[PDB]
Symmetry: C3
Subunit: 459 residues, 3 copies
């Protein structure tokens, strides 16, 4: 592991293009670079890193990096002044935590409205016109809009539009106790979304893959997604545009803006190699181009290459949406916020909770990293109890099966004894009879249990 590099990046990004940068590094230096894209990497990273494992370099939007740093998992990076000047200062702000740089910023990501120019020459300026737009499109076997409803990143622009917010920003400092997921703006936003589902303009089950396939197959007029998605739309040959997100109550949708960033694992014995790879290889016009040609990065942090990329109307639209949204905080509590909003949106979308109760609970859960932890614990314990009860049940049925064969064996022993002219088995061998007797009251008592979450609230 010393003398080589392992890099993790998300499965929706240009990892094959990044591997080409790794191949050039290897060509020039002899150093092997391996790029992986595990699932749930943003959750896997802190677990493996804490034990001194995990990759040398970790790529994610900047919002998770404050927590990683607070947890002891990141090396402070040491770019000199000349390198720092190569990148936009606002990108350096995104990766600064308690005064220290904790990652290299790569690219600015914001969500936009992506629309099919052949189905919809002139896309809606407002969210409110969508149901009527969907009505007409449905008559022709299409739909107006499909996007990932399973990740709150995609719904947040709408929730934020009328006033919803994560943590209040005042005096240059986020207040972790002031959360705006349950104010009037947020409620209106999510109610409008759940209204779309109620009136069957969207489906609660739609996830990344489903929306992408529908848009890329010409089935839906619009989707909501980031620069990474453009590559596959090009391949699909759909005639698409990338524009400003619809307004809600006359207010701009407010995407949470992410800076794709690369951190160095505090436990890496390859911190200098990682620095040189990121600074001398990836963060160059040629390194970034290789990644971008694979899956587009968005508006890159590197001024020299961004000056070219900026002339792309897709990148102009990206930055227009960015300017309307807000840069994500990188505070450790961002993971509690996302977990809470994720739970709210899914619960509300699927009709398992009301909008207002979903959001009230999110408000509580976002307002403490320990709050979600308790929520997560009870959720996981509830699952474990069901797995335990299931195993206990199956063993019971297994035992009943075995008993059935034992009973047949006993009947066969008796029949034969009698047929050969003895008494039945037990008086013949002169033993008190052993009878099958199975108690099941315990098993029945387990099958009665309401789920753990309910029983904890009802105590």
């Amino acid at each position: 592991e010393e003398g080589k590099l392992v890099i993790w990046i998300n499965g929706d990004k240009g990892y094959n293009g990044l591997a080409e940068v790794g191949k050039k590094f290897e060509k020039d230096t002899g150093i092997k670079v391996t790029v992986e894209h595990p699932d749930k990497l943003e959750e896997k990273f802190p677990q493996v890193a804490a034990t001194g494992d995990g990759p040398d370099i970790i790529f994610w939007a900047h919002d998770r990096f404050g927590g990683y740093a607070q947890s002891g998992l990141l090396a402070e990076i040491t770019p000199d002044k000349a390198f720092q000047d190569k990148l936009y200062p606002f990108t350096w702000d995104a990766v600064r935590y308690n005064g220290k740089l904790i990652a290299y910023p790569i690219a600015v990501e914001a969500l936009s409205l992506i629309y099919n120019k052949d189905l919809l020459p002139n896309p809606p300026k407002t969210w409110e016109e969508i149901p009527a737009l969907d009505k007409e499109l449905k008559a022709k076997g299409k739909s107006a809009l499909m996007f990932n409803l399973q990740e709150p990143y995609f719904t947040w622009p709408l929730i934020a539009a009328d006033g919803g917010y994560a943590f209040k920003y005042e005096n240059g400092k986020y207040d972790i106790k002031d959360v705006g997921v349950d104010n009037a703006g947020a409620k209106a936003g999510l109610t409008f979304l759940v209204d779309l589902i109620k009136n069957k303009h969207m489906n609660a089950d739609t996830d990344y893959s489903i929306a992408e396939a529908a848009f890329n197959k010409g089935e839906t007029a619009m989707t909501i997604n980031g620069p990474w998605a453009w590559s596959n739309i090009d391949t699909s040959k759909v005639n698409y545009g990338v524009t400003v997100l619809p307004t809600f109550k006359g207010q701009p949708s407010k995407p949470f803006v992410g800076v794709l960033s690369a951190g160095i694992n505090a436990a890496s014995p390859n911190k200098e190699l990682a620095k040189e790879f990121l600074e001398n290889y990836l963060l160059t016009d040629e390194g970034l181009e290789a990644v971008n040609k694979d899956k587009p990065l968005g508006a890159v942090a590197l001024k020299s290459y961004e000056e070219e990329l900026a002339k792309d109307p897709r990148i102009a639209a990206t930055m227009e949406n960015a300017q309307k949204g807000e840069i994500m905080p990188n505070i450790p509590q961002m993971s509690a916020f996302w977990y809470a909003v994720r739970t709210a949106v899914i619960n509300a979308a699927s009709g398992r909770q009301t909008v207002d109760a979903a959001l009230a609970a999110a408000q509580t859960n976002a307002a403490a990293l320990s709050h979600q932890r308790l929520t997560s614990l009870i959720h996981v314990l509830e699952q474990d109890q069901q797995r335990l009860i299931t195993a206990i049940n199956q063993t019971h049925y297994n035992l009943l099966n075995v008993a059935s064969v034992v009973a047949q064996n006993r009947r066969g022993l008796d029949w034969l004894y009698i047929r050969l002219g003895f008494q039945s088995l037990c008086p013949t061998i002169n033993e008190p009879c052993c009878f099958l007797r199975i108690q099941n009251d315990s098993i029945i008592r387990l099958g009665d249990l309401q789920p753990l979450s309910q029983r904890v609230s009802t105590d």
Copy 2:
């Protein structure tokens, strides 16, 4: 469910009288009203309401409504100025939360001392005289005092008398971090109560039903209860009075005063029908009278009807005790407070904990809604582990039973083989013998486990 009303109210209130109001509503409008009184309604409500179920209207004392509102579960009510003027302003204060009305107030409830005039013509002015009073009554086969020891509502007046308090009220705002369940006043109060149990003037097991039956049967000279209880005493024909609660250390007992209130479920598609039922039907002299004749409501919020009720010496006594106690907060943390005091009082009463350790723990638990949650979780997990271990144990014994029949079957197979002049089973069929071999070290290791609560504290 649209076009009809479902109402929940507690099993100790006039629900048959409320159903008569529902019947009149149905007569005038065609709208069916169904009144239910499930057990634990105050705990069932928030669970079903959060999923968009539960009743249209929920009745409880006002203290729980802040939490329900904070959780997204209540509609703001919209009574006009003319209706608002019909009710006392202090009752409207009880149902106001973060500036909004969240329920209709119905009636003011306070606990009083109810005494048997034939056993006790002149009831005690002080708690301290009770043991000597009980001494003499016991000589004649009676007791001085019996009341519900399972619900802290009933013991709180005593605990509060010498200085105990829930949340500190200053600057018109409750301090959730300043809790007075473990100060000197509170300790003295609960010690005096546990002293009554120690010296056998009361029993820790006495609950609502036991006290009510004893008083109503003429077995005990005194009880502590609310206006709802009077109805059944009338039926019993006991000659009773309703008076000021005894003093403790020369201080008035301080009942936590409740306003029976009716909220509208945020998820009800019948919010206007509910408004009209509460405003045009229940909150009238005739609506309230129908409920009151069933079980007395106390001092009603409706000025017109209260002006009659006030002439009742029982209602005068009720309000004298109310004025000496304090209006309950309606803050979300009230449920943590009640849970904590409930646990303390029962633990101390039953001698499972010392007064001082019981109250110290209550202090901690009341000082955070998340604190009780952890306490409740561990309590529930401890129960679940025991249920799991019990099932695991019974399956083990089931398996031993099955094995016993299998062993007898094997002995019978061998005997017969030999009797028919073969060798035993296994050399005859030419197989290595399979032997019953049951491992039980796991089962024994489970039977060794101290309860979860102890093991978590001892980690």
Copy 3:
């Protein structure tokens, strides 16, 4: 239990000498005194005391007593002015909590460097010289240093040296939210220690017993321990000295100073007997001498006897280290702090976590008594799940064993039926055949579960 005394004291202290004081008490008064030294007494005490059990008198360093008092478990002690003057005021400060005395102080304990004068005539002034010292000692079949790595008390002096601290002390008041276990000083301290283990100058598994035996057997040049340990070194006949702890980065090591103290259980019906035992018997030159001759107490609180003890160069060294360290807080949060640092040090020492991730987690856990509680809960639940799964697994294998005998019984039934000229069992008795059929998918699904802690973090 009324009319006798039960005393708990730790197994490393002079409990046989304390029992001699108990015997003198019994001789003079008739009152039986029983001294016990259960394991984990500091954790057992609060559990048994809360139920009104446990000893009359509890001995521990003063740091745990604030929590015991806050939990309702200690009697305020009532020494008069004349008795108070017998002991140093700073010892009385150690046992004062929210303005009240909650224990009798006995003796001041600080860790020192204990060295073998024959292996090491001139012990190191610095931690940094130890690896080179160990290098040379190892060549002669010895080692430089061995001390208990399982209890953070012993490692803290080093962690504190360069700036690590527990709770920030300002304005005479500890800030429970300002914890210094994860600052630069603390990280450097623990990194140096783990570096010693990496480079094999110490072993992560070394505990109290192992270090004591190695030093007392002449195998290692140095150990770190308190006055109690001297007694067994005397017995060993090793030629030892007791000196100032090594410096780290030119800074003194900073032992957390403990005052061995004796509290009276709030639930004791023997509070006056306990007072008289502690004041009239133990806290005398003769009482303390009896304990000290068993295992040395350190610098005693009793001025009269300390004036003699102070002339001991071992006691001078003890107090030099004390003055360089700091008196422990007695705040309730000390137990969360010790639990957190214990976990960090072991995790880092054993290489299960990195120094930086270990300490970051400790920082979080020390910063709330409820934080550790959640950590402890998940740790205990993880263990319980494994015990449950193990039992579920063994029952499965038990059932497979039983099934194997049942299958052999069936084969023997068939063979015999056929041999006696019938058909096989089932067509002969004219029954559909029952077959053994065991489902195991549940069991396999349980064997797949990652540990609970990981799954809760990954939710």
